[PDB]
Amino acid sequence: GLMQFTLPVRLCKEIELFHFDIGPFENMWPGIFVYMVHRSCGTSCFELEKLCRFIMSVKKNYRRVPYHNWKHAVTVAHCMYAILQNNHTLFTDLERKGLLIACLCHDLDHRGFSNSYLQKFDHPLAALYSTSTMEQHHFSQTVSILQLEGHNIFSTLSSSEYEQVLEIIRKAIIATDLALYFGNRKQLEEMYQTGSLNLNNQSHRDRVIGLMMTACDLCSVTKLWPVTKLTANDIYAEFWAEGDEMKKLGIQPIPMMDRDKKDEVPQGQLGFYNAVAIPCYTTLTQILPPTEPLLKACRDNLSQWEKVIRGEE
Numbered sequence: 001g002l003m004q005f006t007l008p009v010r011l012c013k014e015i016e017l018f019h020f021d022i023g024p025f026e027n028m029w030p031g032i033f034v035y036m037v038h039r040s041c042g043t044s045c046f047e048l049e050k051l052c053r054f055i056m057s058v059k060k061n062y063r064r065v066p067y068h069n070w071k072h073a074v075t076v077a078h079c080m081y082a083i084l085q086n087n088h089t090l091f092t093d094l095e096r097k098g099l100l101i102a103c104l105c106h107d108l109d110h111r112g113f114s115n116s117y118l119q120k121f122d123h124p125l126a127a128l129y130s131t132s133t134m135e136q137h138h139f140s141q142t143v144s145i146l147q148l149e150g151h152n153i154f155s156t157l158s159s160s161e162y163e164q165v166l167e168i169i170r171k172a173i174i175a176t177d178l179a180l181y182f183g184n185r186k187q188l189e190e191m192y193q194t195g196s197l198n199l200n201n202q203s204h205r206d207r208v209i210g211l212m213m214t215a216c217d218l219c220s221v222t223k224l225w226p227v228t229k230l231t232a233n234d235i236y237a238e239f240w241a242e243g244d245e246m247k248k249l250g251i252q253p254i255p256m257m258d259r260d261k262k263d264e265v266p267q268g269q270l271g272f273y274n275a276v277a278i279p280c281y282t283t284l285t286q287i288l289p290p291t292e293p294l295l296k297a298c299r300d301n302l303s304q305w306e307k308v309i310r311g312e313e
């Protein structure tokens with residue numbers, strides 16, 4: 001109390017932009033997160049001692065995989081922060097509180113494998129959670145960490161405020177299951193077009209917060225081209241390892257996961273931008289107009305993948 005986090009000038013300003021890159025200095029990421037909570041939620045949302053202890057236990061439970069790591073957690077929270085700060089007055093006090101935490105926690109204890117690999121390996125998590133296998137695990141890890149002594153950042157909330165925030169976080173985290181995204185965006189499309197979209201309807205906020213989660217989760221496609229391209233390398237490093245593991249189980253992996261089919265990456269990025277990213281950011285921009293720079297940067301990065309195919313890089 002009276003203790004602002006502040007950042008150096010270039011970060012203080014660039015952090016407000018959608019395309020911000022949190023940088024290679026790991027020891028600055030926790031401070032970057034606290035700075036975003038303090039400015040998004042207020043310096044009174046969380047007891048600093050408890051928040052710091054929660055952040056460090058969350059960090060310790062991300063693994064050293066090439067993509068689904070602690071840098072991803074904080075990257076997906078920064079995007080969510082930019083959305084919240086550019087749409088200040090559309091979100092409740094409890095939403096602003098839950099959603100950044102949801103983003104920090106959304107991939108907790110990920111191992112670098114798809115729900116499909118879990119299910120074909122017959123991993124124990126695939127018997128406990130038949131659909132959204134990893135995403136039910138991530139929420140489960142969030143509640144475990146919140147119940148450690150000194151880790152309950154939500155202590156000051158009423159019984160009912162506490163239940164509403166754990167439920168915002170659960171739905172936020174489940175929505176990051178891209179299998180759920182296609183149906184969620186189709187329904188959001190129809191509802192905005194027929195004019196039936198209603199932000200007082202809790203089931204409508206739910207869908208809208210779910211789309212925000214998919215947008216933040218995919219936010220490597222909204223960065224400066226060299227961030228986009230270099231993150232892609234991490235992303236394939238996991239897909240190809242998964243593919244290698246599929247081959248070990250006696251299963252031909254999908255092309256996306258086969259390191260033998262590297263040559264086709266450019267065209268696979270095009271499919272993903274056209275089938276997933278662009279429609280995601282299009283529908284999001286319709287509903288929250290100030291998110292348009294996510295759409296515009298996604299478009300620039302698609303045209304960069306096109307250039308790759310055309311031999312221009």
Ligand SMILES: CN(CCF)C(=O)c1cnn(C)c1C(=O)Nc1ccn2nc(-c3ccccc3)nc2c1
Binds near residue numbers: 261269
């Ligand atoms: C993390 N994640 C999934 C969670 F693990 C993602 O989808 C995700 C998030 N951000 N970005 C950029 C990605 C991503 O690149 N997605 C995709 C999605 C489909 N294809 N198909 C190919 C391909 C197909 C045939 C031949 C070669 C390649 N390549 C991709 C790449």
Ligand SMILES: [Mg+2]
Binds near residue numbers: 106176
């Ligand atoms: Mg995930």
Ligand SMILES: [Zn+2]
Binds near residue numbers: 217
């Ligand atoms: Zn993620």
